[PDB]
Scaffold this active site. Structure first.
Site, PDB file in Angstrom:
ATOM      1  N   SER A 105       2.108   1.044   3.049  1.00  0.00           N
ATOM      2  CA  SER A 105       1.458   1.526   1.955  1.00  0.00           C
ATOM      3  C   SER A 105       2.289   2.341   1.073  1.00  0.00           C
ATOM      4  O   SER A 105       2.055   2.218  -0.044  1.00  0.00           O
ATOM      5  CB  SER A 105       0.280   2.426   2.393  1.00  0.00           C
ATOM      6  OG  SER A 105      -0.554   2.659   1.377  1.00  0.00           O
ATOM      7  N   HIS A 110      -0.265  17.650   0.034  1.00  0.00           N
ATOM      8  CA  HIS A 110       0.755  16.941   1.117  1.00  0.00           C
ATOM      9  C   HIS A 110       1.721  17.463   1.484  1.00  0.00           C
ATOM     10  O   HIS A 110       2.431  17.367   2.350  1.00  0.00           O
ATOM     11  CB  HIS A 110       1.371  15.599   0.191  1.00  0.00           C
ATOM     12  CG  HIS A 110       0.263  14.442  -0.472  1.00  0.00           C
ATOM     13  ND1 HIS A 110      -0.583  14.017   0.476  1.00  0.00           N
ATOM     14  CD2 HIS A 110       0.407  14.025  -1.612  1.00  0.00           C
ATOM     15  CE1 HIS A 110      -1.525  13.222  -0.513  1.00  0.00           C
ATOM     16  NE2 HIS A 110      -0.727  13.090  -1.567  1.00  0.00           N
ATOM     17  N   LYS A 161      -0.387   8.286   1.521  1.00  0.00           N
ATOM     18  CA  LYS A 161      -0.878   7.396   1.630  1.00  0.00           C
ATOM     19  C   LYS A 161      -1.863   7.242   3.055  1.00  0.00           C
ATOM     20  O   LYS A 161      -2.006   6.099   3.655  1.00  0.00           O
ATOM     21  CB  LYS A 161       0.163   6.262   2.018  1.00  0.00           C
ATOM     22  CG  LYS A 161       1.418   6.422   0.943  1.00  0.00           C
ATOM     23  CD  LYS A 161       0.642   6.594  -0.626  1.00  0.00           C
ATOM     24  CE  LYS A 161      -0.225   5.405  -1.003  1.00  0.00           C
ATOM     25  NZ  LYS A 161      -1.083   5.775  -2.292  1.00  0.00           N
TER      26      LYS A 161
HETATM   27  N1  LIG Z   1     -12.525   3.572   0.135  1.00  0.00           N
HETATM   28  C1  LIG Z   1     -11.281   3.232   0.753  1.00  0.00           C
HETATM   29  N2  LIG Z   1     -11.350   2.694   1.895  1.00  0.00           N
HETATM   30  C2  LIG Z   1     -10.197   2.123   2.676  1.00  0.00           C
HETATM   31  N3  LIG Z   1      -8.900   2.442   2.045  1.00  0.00           N
HETATM   32  C3  LIG Z   1      -8.867   3.149   0.978  1.00  0.00           C
HETATM   33  C4  LIG Z   1     -10.131   3.646   0.320  1.00  0.00           C
HETATM   34  N4  LIG Z   1      -9.590   4.234  -0.964  1.00  0.00           N
HETATM   35  C5  LIG Z   1      -8.425   4.175  -0.863  1.00  0.00           C
HETATM   36  N5  LIG Z   1      -7.909   3.599   0.324  1.00  0.00           N
HETATM   37  C6  LIG Z   1      -6.257   3.393   0.671  1.00  0.00           C
HETATM   38  O1  LIG Z   1      -5.784   4.635   1.003  1.00  0.00           O
HETATM   39  C7  LIG Z   1      -4.257   4.517   0.601  1.00  0.00           C
HETATM   40  C8  LIG Z   1      -3.890   5.431  -0.377  1.00  0.00           C
HETATM   41  O2  LIG Z   1      -3.907   6.732   0.525  1.00  0.00           O
HETATM   42  P1  LIG Z   1      -3.902   7.883  -0.682  1.00  0.00           P
HETATM   43  O3  LIG Z   1      -5.122   8.034  -1.338  1.00  0.00           O
HETATM   44  O4  LIG Z   1      -3.594   9.034   0.580  1.00  0.00           O
HETATM   45  O5  LIG Z   1      -2.394   7.767  -1.407  1.00  0.00           O
HETATM   46  C9  LIG Z   1      -4.102   2.932   0.157  1.00  0.00           C
HETATM   47  O6  LIG Z   1      -4.043   2.120   1.331  1.00  0.00           O
HETATM   48  P2  LIG Z   1      -3.032   0.668   1.357  1.00  0.00           P
HETATM   49  O7  LIG Z   1      -2.037   0.723   0.162  1.00  0.00           O
HETATM   50  O8  LIG Z   1      -2.815   0.122   2.651  1.00  0.00           O
HETATM   51  O9  LIG Z   1      -4.029  -0.426   0.779  1.00  0.00           O
HETATM   52  C10 LIG Z   1      -5.523   2.719  -0.192  1.00  0.00           C
HETATM   53  O10 LIG Z   1      -5.907   1.229  -0.650  1.00  0.00           O
END
Ligand SMILES: Nc1ncnc2c1ncn2[C@@H]1O[C@H](COP(=O)(O)O)[C@@H](OP(=O)(O)O)[C@H]1O
Ligand SMILES: Nc1ncnc2c1ncn2[C@@H]1O[C@H](COP(=O)(O)O)[C@@H](OP(=O)(O)O)[C@H]1O
Lengths: 289, 289
Positions: free
Chosen positions: B132, B102, B42
């Site tokens: 998140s 990860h 996340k």
């Molecule tokens: N283009 C983007 N800009 C900002 N946040 C993004 C994004 N794409 C994905 N995310 C966010 O990155 C987090 C997921 O992380 P990962 O891809 O490592 O699992 C989520 O945050 P939130 O749950 O705070 O919205 C998701 O919303």
């Protein structure tokens, strides 16, 4: 009928229907807060119209999808049987209003000059305009038969096309910017640096936007984006008015592509003629980037 | 079954299936030109994955739509019944390859460090990560029951969640960037200035792009764009794996929204604990912009 001949009004060759629209237009009342988008055909009317509407909607795309661009920005002298004239569409257009026209200064409603309406004028080099206009004539059935490209280019040089002389148009509006508030833009400049031009427009209309929202406008006013946006590419109009299978409204959106259409002979003839026509004009265009 | 308990491997709590994937992974051979995207869950894995793939495809959106992001960027330790492990998906992934993991340094295939594979690490402040992750636990059925938010936060502080301690993860990879080529990014920095970060990435991978193409990447790697792009929002995966009606993968994409979830008491308890854990670390995060 179909592809009817142009009609002259005060020395300007006009599409029959538009010439008719000039009668009612004499009653049109401009408001101090109107914004008039003025251009010689095929210089970037749609392009700057989308830019301005996005700015007016605070960059909200959803709002910009509320209807086609010709609906959001009423076409002043527009007219067609069974469809409300642009002048009518302007009765239900909320202020501040964005308006569009291609009319030479000689046919422009006096009320717009007296009310000191802010004008956003866009010019494009004559060669790209001519070529763009040639293809537009083909798909927009409302125009008379364009004939061969060589023939059209010939009529273009003498201003014997819809809306008259390109040379006269770009020059008179350039001169107007001395006694009237006019932001004079260049299609090529916008191609070169979109953001830079969008920022000048913002300042002109005395508005501001978050750096991020501006970059957002830039992206959604790009050729690629506007070509696919049905609210700006004109694909929603009846094929009887515009036939995109003959030539898409959003054709190429490039500066300098006139070179694959103009022959060497036409080019030399055009340059010679161009120099005489633009002699005493401080205006300076770029044929390519 | 459903929501099975985590399984410990070398002190790291892992999703049962992923722990199983570590066996085959011992045969994985890294190539000198691989690029490993590493993150604690996340922190912006998907986000930086899309950025990198666009850069790798020269900004060509069509190419970036060739398949979902988890397909274009194989998930190294990924595994699930009936589906090829990420390690298998990597057999048909053309070079240069983009890889995702990860895994804590203790479980990372040695071959990646020996081959000096370029690493793009992304960190995010612990509070936004925790929140998140809490919502991710809910929609991604593969995880064990998250329990109440207060309970989850408690397990998060002791690293008793999938993949272990956030504190350990961000710190060890930060220390690795001293003996290994690692570009250490911050989710908040990317939120603040996307282009600035995308430019650092470009330099790191020794590539270049036209100013205009870069602005293009910025726009298509924005939350808004990635949320609607089915090749990046994970909406194509079976609901049995991810249930978007419980919580969308693309949730909010903001920095600082942890404040509407953390209570005042949890916040004070977390700050206290955080200070002890990050004491001897030169790393410095931003909880908001
Ligand atoms: N283009 C983007 N800009 C900002 N946040 C993004 C994004 N794409 C994905 N995310 C966010 O990155 C987090 C997921 O992380 P990962 O891809 O490592 O699992 C989520 O945050 P939130 O749950 O705070 O919205 C998701 O919303
Ligand atoms: N966003 C954009 N960027 C560049 N050119 C655009 C554009 N939107 C429309 N155009 C071009 O502007 C011309 C039409 O002008 P107008 O809207 O005044 O009729 C067409 O040029 P071409 O025919 O050269 O492609 C069209 O492609």
């Amino acid at each position: 009928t179909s592809r009817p001949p142009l009609e002259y009004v005060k020395g300007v060759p006009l599409i029959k229907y538009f010439a008719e629209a000039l009668g009612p237009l004499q009653s049109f009342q401009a408001r101090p807060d109107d914004l008039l988008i003025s251009t010689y055909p095929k210089s970037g009317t749609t392009w700057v119209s989308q830019i301005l509407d996005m700015i007016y909607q605070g960059g909200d795309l959803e709002k910009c999808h509320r209807a086609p661009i010709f609906m959001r920005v009423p076409f002043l002298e527009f007219k067609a049987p069974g469809i409300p004239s642009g002048m009518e569409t302007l009765k239900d257009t909320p202020a501040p209003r964005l308006l569009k026209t291609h009319l030479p200064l000689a046919l422009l409603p006096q009320t717009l000059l007296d009310q000191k309406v802010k004008v956003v004028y866009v010019a494009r080099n004559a060669k790209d305009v001519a070529v763009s206009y040639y293809h537009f004539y083909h798909m927009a059935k409302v125009h008379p038969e364009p004939g061969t490209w060589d023939s059209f280019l010939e009529k273009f040089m003498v201003g014997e096309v819809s809306y008259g002389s390109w040379y006269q148009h770009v020059q008179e509006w350039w001169e107007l910017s001395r006694t009237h508030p006019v932001l004079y833009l260049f299609y090529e400049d916008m191609k070169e640096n979109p953001k830079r031009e969008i920022q000048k427009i913002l300042e002109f209309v005395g508005r501001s936007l978050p750096e991020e929202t501006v970059d957002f406008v830039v992206q959604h006013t790009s050729f690629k984006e506007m070509k696919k946006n049905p609210m700006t590419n004109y694909t929603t109009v009846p094929q009887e008015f515009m036939d995109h299978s003959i030539s898409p409204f959003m054709r190429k959106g490039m500066a300098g592509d006139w070179k694959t259409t103009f022959t060497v002979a036409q080019n030399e003839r055009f340059d010679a003629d161009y120099a005489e026509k633009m002699a005493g004009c401080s205006l300076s265009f770029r044929s390519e980037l």
